Write a protein that binds this ligand. Structure first.
Ligand SMILES: O=C(O)CCC(=O)C(=O)O
Ligand SMILES: O=C(O)CCC(=O)C(=O)O
Ligand SMILES: [Mg+2]
Ligand SMILES: [Mn+2]
Ligand SMILES: [Mn+2]
Lengths: 313, 312
């Protein structure tokens, strides 16, 4: 074996022997700030806290309640034919990384489309702090100070507060973010598949042309390639494996990955640490809110960049 | 190629750490931080910090040679002796370079102090490590207050694995090395000068494999090196002298960014796990330090991979 493969084997064997990123820790009570810093933040270790929050939103936010309170609020909604916004899809023999069709519609109309199983897949998934921007009133039904146990490790206000409301057909393909993520389910449940960053060499990634979903004048979906002004394709690096049904013949290295599964119910909190890979599915019309905090860099980022170099094409 | 695949990977590591200035300075505080602050800013970042005039222990001031001699009943203490001042350090004999362990003997503290006052004699250091303050000198603990270190100890969440007492000649130098411990270092009298290099700069720090030896005295009291056997024994050790580095022989060291910090009496230095350190001291400097076993995380695994990539 090559020098690089020997090094990656050392990394993976040491992490397995030491149980690094080998489980999602479960707590039945919110930890102290010091506990959270020592056990989860400092160790880049995910944790789920069960029945942590009793926010008024939990039990009150239903599709009906949201229509009554904010039914006329125009919100950004993503639409795909296949349920994979920010996901891989083929057209005319080429695999693209595809961005969703994005549009504005009344929340009332979104809920109506979520209740139509024969139509396209809709998901309010804008991020970009869309709760603060589009649905600020909903803030009164949250108590963000309850998250201080975690926020004290990040020592900064949230970069973003996002509101999520989606079809059970809407699946979030595996990716990673450069944020600390405090994820709070309000209604329904979310199913996460998580892979730690040090298993990068086990996660196949490719470079794909970028496209966006559009509909034709007759209503058929298609993919429009994104291009620069010069006319050259724009490209996105993206995880190539489907963790729900992995093709081990195409991606034998993924047999060495140890993906973790966690379901997050209403009132639970998930800490999803920076740079962890995550794939997400949801119950139908699941509602969630999450808080993103910019990461504080240390040598783990530098090692991860090295690992990207060692696993590059 | 022009560069190995491993060399290209190491160059990316170093470039990214340089742009972010990882481990580029020892943070200086004038007040002890809260436990949460220490965990967030220093422990979780594997980041050294020096806290100035942090401790008011009675030892800082009471501990003179005479006081220690009284308090310990002129006990026989273990002392390390070398001819050159480099216990656990490189030295050459008969054209061969060895990693040399000190001569270890026991003498009354009164005699140690007498020898520390002889510049023409060999270099003496009380530096037993293991846990020689708790195990071999317990009477001294009454002049400290270890709970004052709780701000740090709460991040480690375990008692010290060792508490060491250090009292040395200004000629005694601790060559550059790393430890698999969190270290809380407390100077009692005098000062210590540290040169520190962060773990991710391992590829810049030259290391060799040397035969192991130990200092012994001849018939006439003069020192020589006896090679150590166990059947041929060898030690991996840092090859560079950080005080006057030979950049012609070790050009990679020009990429390291060593940090200098002087730790005075009453100051605390947190030396995080696996940081390289070289240590010099004032004459008859006294220090105590607390070692805590590390709590493994992803960063340790990456470092083990790095050790494999730079095996040298
Ligand atoms: O809820 C989802 O579908 C995606 C959540 C996600 O990717 C995030 O919180 O970063
Ligand atoms: O004080 C010295 O000479 C060395 C201290 C040291 O190496 C340590 O505390 O780990
Ligand atoms: Mg200084
Ligand atoms: Mn995400
Ligand atoms: Mn040491």
């Amino acid at each position: 074996m090559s020098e690089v493969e020997r090094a990656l084997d050392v990394l993976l064997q040491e992490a397995e022997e030491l149980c690094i990123g080998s489980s999602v820790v479960e707590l039945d009570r919110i930890p102290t700030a010091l506990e959270f810093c020592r056990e989860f933040y400092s160790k880049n270790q995910p944790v789920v806290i069960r029945k942590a929050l009793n926010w008024p939103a939990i039990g009150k936010w239903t599709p009906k309640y949201l229509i009554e309170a904010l039914g006329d609020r125009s919100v950004d909604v993503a639409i795909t034919p296949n349920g994979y916004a920010d996901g891989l899809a083929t057209q005319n023999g080429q695999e693209y990384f595809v961005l969703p069709l994005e549009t504005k519609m009344k929340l009332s109309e979104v809920v109506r489309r979520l209740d139509d199983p024969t139509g396209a897949v809709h998901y309010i998934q804008k991020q970009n702090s869309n709760l603060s921007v589009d649905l600020p009133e909903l803030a009164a039904d949250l108590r963000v100070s309850d998250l201080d146990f975690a926020q004290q490790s990040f020592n900064k206000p949230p970069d973003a507060v996002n509101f999520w409301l989606g079809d059970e057909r809407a699946v979030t393909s595996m990716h990673k973010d450069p944020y600390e993520n405090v994820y709070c389910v309000i209604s329904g449940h979310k199913d996460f598949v998580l892979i730690p960053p040090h298993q990068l060499s086990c996660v196949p990634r490719g470079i794909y042309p970028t496209g966006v979903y559009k509909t034709s004048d007759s209503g058929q979906f298609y993919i429009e390639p994104l291009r620069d002004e010069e006319g050259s394709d724009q490209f996105t690096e993206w995880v190539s494996v489907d963790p729900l049904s992995p093709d081990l013949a195409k991606y034998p290295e993924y047999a060495r990955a140890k993906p973790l599964k966690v379901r997050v119910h209403a009132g639970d909190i998930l800490y999803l640490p920076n740079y962890w890979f995550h794939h997400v599915s949801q119950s139908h019309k699941c509602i969630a809110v999450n808080f993103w905090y910019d990461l504080d860099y240390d040598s783990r980022y530098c090692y991860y960049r090295m690992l990207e170099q060692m696993t590059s094409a």
